[PDB]
Design a protein around this ligand. Structure first.
Ligand SMILES: *[C@](C)(O)C(=O)N(c1ccc(-c2ccccc2)nc1)[C@@](C)(C(=O)N[C@@H](C)c1ccc(F)cc1)c1cccnc1
Ligand SMILES: *[C@](C)(O)C(=O)N(c1ccc(-c2ccccc2)nc1)[C@@](C)(C(=O)N[C@@H](C)c1ccc(F)cc1)c1cccnc1
Lengths: 298, 299
């Protein structure tokens, strides 16, 4: 009953956040087994001239690393560079290591940001990757290395590590495989995101959310083809639709066709009059199909 | 960098949530130090008429009780009804019982809800108590006994325990002392919900979040005395403000005083005219002052 951007329980991610301190600059690290993942820009302090990472890696002094989880210091042994990640090998092994697996996020999916500062978690909240492979969370200085995760069946899927904040207030993270989302760079040059187009299959589950909760005022008998929308979608800041197979489960209980919401979206997109839907005066892509089913039918 | 309702880390609370079952009704409970707390309506299975809890508490067979945390089954020992809650004593002690304590919340504060189903933690999100003393969150069938909590320095303070769901989709819970908030009944008979009046400080904090976040189209140079607003707040669905000395820090960083917002509240409470503030169609008391300071400046 209701609809809120809720985050999954952060309890398993929480023991792994460490404080990685290389010289002056100190940031957040994900500690799993004997390895500690952190953004490689910790090795940089320039923040003014283009950084030649290939050279600074070979010219690194491990005596300056001091990694910690509270009062314990983990002893640094080695460190290799996996993309934009600086995978650091420490002697102590995280006794608190959950069952983890790395995965990459496909645009539109939801995941959980464990905002951390100085190796201490601050808050957990759910976000979705946008059409530009950037997120719109809440971050302040020192968050570099805060993990993002999805969790299915007592197993953590580290899908995000924070790297940098764009001027857009948009946040760019790396993959745990070392791959910047959206093709951006950890470089001190100005970078601009593209136009954020709303993810269509999240807006649909958001409209079934309104019909399950009885708000049927916006809905009418009109229906549009998957095709005519895909044509209309690009020119109106929306993503195209591949198929409508998964909604058929919800479409039956509601009795509202998939082709019928499309006619509504073409109308409702930049169309909400005074009347709002579920607390929103504009369509939103925050809510996925998975999230709707967990908040509506257990 | 953004305004994002977020919950504090729920790691310490997750060891304590247990599956409490008494025959048909199965719902969640908090396992603190060898005592499981749960709503007293787990004993009742009837949702027709008003139920004599004093007579149902005595018609209680402890042998019927089934508590479990995963595969482990707890052995129930004692059971005393405290208010609208059930303090159940068991043999094993939650060995991971955090630095815990109870509290009752004055209206307007923000706390952290841990929704559970079948003794399984499932989500965690921030919510603030409305003036009617009903939070408004997400709860499906079987979430009775999901604890709320607020954490000040690794010490867990349990403040909520889910009891019932009203008509307005408003959610009602009980403190760990066994008192239904706002004075409600855990009975099936129909029950009214009050008119939600907005907490003024949390609206002011929400407005500073907008001035810090750039949206300054609604702000002009109007200063309003606090009493004229209080006289106006008693007649327009707001609350009277006690002090604005905590806002002294946000006012200096924005350069906008607290008086300007107070007049601005009188302006926009009528309606935002289709122009949203921070992605919000109307004024919102969701963001408390302290939570706004951790997100904007990071304390
Ligand atoms: C990290 C260090 O904790 C941090 O908060 N930010 C940051 C700072 C510097 C770098 C960086 C330095 C040298 C080379 C490459 C990257 N990355 C991240 C903040 C302060 C940040 O990103 N600021 C922006 C303006 C920035 C971009 C690029 C850059 F090189 C330097 C700064 C930051 C603040 C808030 C949230 N996230 C990150
Ligand atoms: C709990 C059992 O998990 C549950 O979801 N609900 C509930 C059901 C019954 C009682 C109750 C039983 C006996 C005596 C008094 C109360 N409390 C809670 C739900 C289904 C619920 O609250 N339904 C409403 C209609 C209800 C209110 C009051 C009442 F006495 C009986 C029923 C529920 C649904 C969704 C969210 N929370 C609770």
């Amino acid at each position: 009953a209701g609809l809120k951007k809720m985050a999954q329980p952060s309890g398993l991610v929480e023991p792994c956040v460490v404080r990685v301190s290389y010289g002056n600059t100190v940031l957040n690290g994900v500690w799993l087994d004997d390895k500690v993942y952190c953004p490689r820009h910790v090795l940089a302090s320039d923040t003014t001239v283009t950084i030649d990472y290939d050279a600074v890696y070979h010219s690194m002094r491990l005596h300056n690393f001091s990694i910690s989880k509270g009062n314990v210091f983990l002893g640094v042994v080695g460190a290799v560079m996996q993309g934009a990640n600086l995978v650091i090998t420490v002697s102590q092994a995280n006794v608190n290591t959950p069952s983890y697996s790395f995965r990459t996020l496909k645009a539109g999916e939801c995941f959980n940001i464990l905002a951390c500062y100085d190796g201490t978690p601050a808050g957990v909240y759910g976000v979705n990757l946008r059409s530009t492979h950037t997120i719109k969370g809440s971050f302040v200085n020192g968050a570099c290395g805060s993990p993002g995760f999805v969790m299915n069946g007592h197993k953590v899927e580290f899908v995000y590590m924070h790297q940098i904040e764009l001027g857009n207030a948009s946040h760019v993270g790396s993959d745990m495989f070392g791959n910047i989302y959206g093709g951006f760079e950890d470089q001190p040059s100005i970078q601009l995101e593209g136009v954020a187009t709303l993810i269509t299959e999240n807006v649909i589950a958001f409209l079934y959310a309104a019909l399950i909760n009885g708000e049927r005022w916006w809905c009418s008998n009109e229906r549009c083809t998957i095709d005519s929308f895909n044509e209309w979608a690009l020119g109106n800041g929306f993503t195209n639709l591949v198929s409508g197979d998964g909604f058929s489960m919800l479409a039956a209980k509601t009795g509202v066709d998939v082709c019928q919401l499309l006619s509504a979206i073409q109308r409702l997109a930049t169309g909400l009059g005074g009347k709002t839907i579920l607390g929103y005066a504009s369509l939103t892509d925050e809510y996925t199909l998975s999230e709707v089913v967990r908040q509506m039918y257990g």
